[PDB]
Write a protein that binds this ligand. Structure first.
Ligand SMILES: Nc1ncnc2c1ncn2[C@@H]1O[C@H](COP(=O)(O)OP(=O)(O)OP(=O)(O)O)[C@@H](O)[C@H]1O
Ligand SMILES: Nc1ncnc2c1ncn2[C@@H]1O[C@H](COP(=O)(O)OP(=O)(O)OP(=O)(O)O)[C@@H](O)[C@H]1O
Ligand code: NA
Lengths: 438, 468
């Protein structure tokens, strides 16, 4: 059943419907769908209006019979029949209500979050993404790519010894690379703790019902493994953003003078159904990887979320600067944005052997898209004419395997890989991991 | 289906079969079963004897036809196979010299009939092989001579060694401490999201978790172990070489959606063992020592509502594991077992945790283990010793199942009277959530939990995590 889509409230006002139509056109999506959603919703509201009315009339029938029969009268027989009929009508109204919600929500799958005014308008990323900032020597060239380096270290196995055990794109890390992996986890966690984030270690399973509130329906198809055996069926998490968002379901923050900031720490599991033969090379694109994630829950007011988005990307930049990895920050074009995001920044690191900018980090302001889906409310209650929801953002701090790949290319020498200065105290003071002699 | 059970070769020797029957009796397990396993294997070897005879006869048929056609011999009167010929190949006594008396039409029919026999024999072979290993599910590794002989743990285990003050008492148990810290959520906010026994850790407890992972890994690196980060999925075929059928029912989650069905690992021992499948170490002058690092996933199907509370027994937890592959000769694996339990002891001493070491009795040993030591840490608020660590010598039980051979591997070697396999051992260094529970009880004060000295540099120098 459950699925994550845009708030219905914005559709029920002429000005809001026009905001959504405009955002649809700017995303290269269908604006005509907004009318279809308003109509389905108008029918749905009608069923709810009749249901609330008829329920009140069911008590009228009950109280009437209670007063009449206490008065010792032999119309009661009619009132009883009318109670059964209204209960029948309410039952019929509910089945119709259900069908209409299903139709509405399925139409809404095609409606994205309202674009920020700064999002570039383009359908294609190569031409369409706008470069915001660059850091370091982004034209640097180096000898060996990350796959060759990790193979020459003797510290990564992606051969049939592993894939015949664990399937395609599975890998073993050994020795110095595991030390580096752990160094990055711990350094990444500390980096965020120092910036006011609360560490958060989630369950790696979510139930279907809950996963449906924080995942787009296409993610079930392309990205989420199903887990079974123990009670209800579950899904492995693709990112700690899922359980962190789900953790706020049904919550209500009367105010958030300070944001909630979490440093999500987890293994991430991705089926990568789309990537038939994209990579297959190294640990750059794998089904299982550690990631440290920024997650922010904040007030929906005064565009505070937009300020946090800037802080979050700046945080990921400062992290990569600390590692000395060259990069560019790009503002993702409207055609490439997922539905939840109102704006997205990617930090794409320069891979000097490979000769390419490759995404290490994405940071998104999802405003009230997830929040309305998980029902994470904000402010005072209606009983204020609008229901307010918290804003939520999420952004990579460090995706560990891709960052390891970038470090290997950028810090290679003839003898091995130099460990970035900041990571050394997190791996026993090791200055370099060395190639197998030949 | 794929299955981890004892090696067959020792069953086919009278002295070997008796050693196995004796070990079974000493485990309070079934010896009578060995006769049933020998019989199932006898049936199996018969299908191989016939298969090899018939495969050779098929080649003789082809060569005979070739020679007859070359000489322009007439094809013959009939393709009908003499009943004695059918009887002979069904019994494995048909000789090539007799086959060569047949005409071309007969040789052709016989080649087809022998091919059908070879196909029927492959199916018989596998129903017999499944029936056999299933009977083998109940047969344990040969006990080391020092294993206490008893059925029940609570009385049969032998306390070997103790460390620290194991009678001190403390006020709050680990559940109450982690609650008062505000850093562990096991409420419906979490369980309605992720199911029973699910948890969220926050704040200082995540810092402590990471500190333990990194300190544990460093602890083993300093002792010559190679870090090993595995895939957390194993496919059915491979999982069955390193697990018994009962673990599929009680312990292993199934994962699907992409490729064939896989299982989540319950310990890094599984993928590390599997990684050695089909290997052949001609010599291991030094052992291979691995420091396994992984999340472990356990259904806990048996422990339905056994513990329930806190993070002591959960479905998902980090663990750092010792895994050793070594020579099967000169009782070397027994020396490694002693070093491994000592390493886990020194780790706990370094954390300042009191404990006892117990030698696990014969009746309570799992099948793969020839001997097992557990380290049970003292939980002063619970008032009990609770298992933190197990270390076992599985000698060649996993290695035979995964086919990890030892010894010279040279051309010209025929049917080897004794195939040798490596020995494998495994032992917990640190199960992270249980160690956190132990630390919380032992290091509690009025204001919170004091961080053990050795972990402080691994969590930004923090000396204490404070109650809300
Ligand atoms: N299959 C993978 N293997 C290793 N790292 C990955 C993989 N998928 C994503 N990452 C890392 O996680 C970061 C965040 O990825 P995200 O959750 O945004 O998924 P995505 O499909 O890349 O979506 P987006 O288009 O927003 O980046 C990426 O920038 C990358 O560093
Ligand atoms: N469900 C669990 N939750 C948290 N920690 C666990 C769990 N199961 C095992 N552990 C930890 O892992 C360690 C090793 O566990 P092991 O794999 O040996 O499983 P076991 O069946 O509980 O123990 P044994 O080996 O004695 O049968 C235990 O000593 C304990 O510290
Ligand atoms: Na340049």
């Amino acid at each position: 059943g459950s699925m994550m889509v845009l708030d219905i409230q914005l559709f029920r006002d002429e000005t809001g419907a026009n905001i959504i139509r405009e955002s649809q056109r700017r995303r290269f999506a269908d604006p005509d769908i907004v009318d279809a959603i308003i109509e389905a919703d108008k029918k749905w509201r009608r069923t709810q209006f009749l249901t609330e009315a008829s329920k009140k009339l069911i008590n009228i029938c009950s109280k009437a019979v209670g007063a009449k029969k206490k008065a010792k009268e032999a119309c009661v027989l009619q009132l009883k029949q009318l109670s059964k009929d209204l209960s029948d009508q309410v039952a019929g109204l509910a089945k119709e209500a259900q069908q209409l919600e299903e139709e509405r929500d399925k139409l809404m799958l095609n409606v994205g979050n309202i674009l920020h005014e700064s999002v570039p308008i383009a359908q294609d990323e190569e031409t369409g993404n706008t470069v915001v900032r660059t850091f370091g020597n982004t034209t640097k060239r180096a000898k060996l790519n990350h796959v060759s380096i990790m193979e020459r270290l003797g510290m990564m196995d992606t051969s049939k010894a592993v894939t015949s055990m664990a399937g395609g794109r599975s890998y073993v890390l050994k020795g110095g690379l595991v030390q580096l992996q752990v160094a990055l986890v711990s350094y990444s966690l500390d980096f965020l703790v120092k910036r006011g984030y609360t560490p958060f270690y989630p369950p790696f399973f979510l139930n279907r019902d809950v996963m449906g509130e924080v995942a787009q329906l296409s993610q079930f198809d392309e990205e989420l493994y199903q887990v079974s055996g123990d009670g209800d069926k579950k899904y492995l998490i693709a990112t700690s953003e899922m359980p962190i968002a789900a953790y706020h379901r049904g919550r209500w923050f009367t105010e958030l003078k300070e944001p909630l900031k979490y440093a999500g720490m987890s293994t991430c599991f991705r089926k990568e159904a789309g990537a038939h033969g994209r990579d297959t090379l190294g640990i750059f694109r794998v089904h299982q990887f550690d990631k440290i994630e920024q997650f922010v829950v904040c007030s929906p007011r005064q565009e505070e979320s937009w300020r946090h988005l800037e802080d979050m990307i700046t945080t990921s930049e400062e992290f990569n600067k600390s590692l000395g990895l060259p990069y560019r920050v790009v503002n993702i074009c409207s055609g490439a944005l997922n539905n939840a995001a109102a704006k997205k920044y990617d930090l794409e690191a320069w891979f000097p052997a490979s000769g390419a900018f490759r995404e290490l980090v994405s940071c998104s302001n999802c405003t009230d898209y997830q929040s309305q889906s998980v029902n994470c409310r904000y402010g005072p209650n209606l009983r204020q004419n609008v229901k307010e929801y918290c804003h939520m953002l999420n952004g990579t701090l460090c995706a560990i395997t891709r960052t390891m790949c970038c470090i290997c290319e950028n810090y290679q020498t003839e003898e091995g890989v130099v460990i970035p200065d900041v990571l050394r105290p997190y791996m026993m003071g090791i200055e370099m991991i060395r190639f197998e002699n030949n």
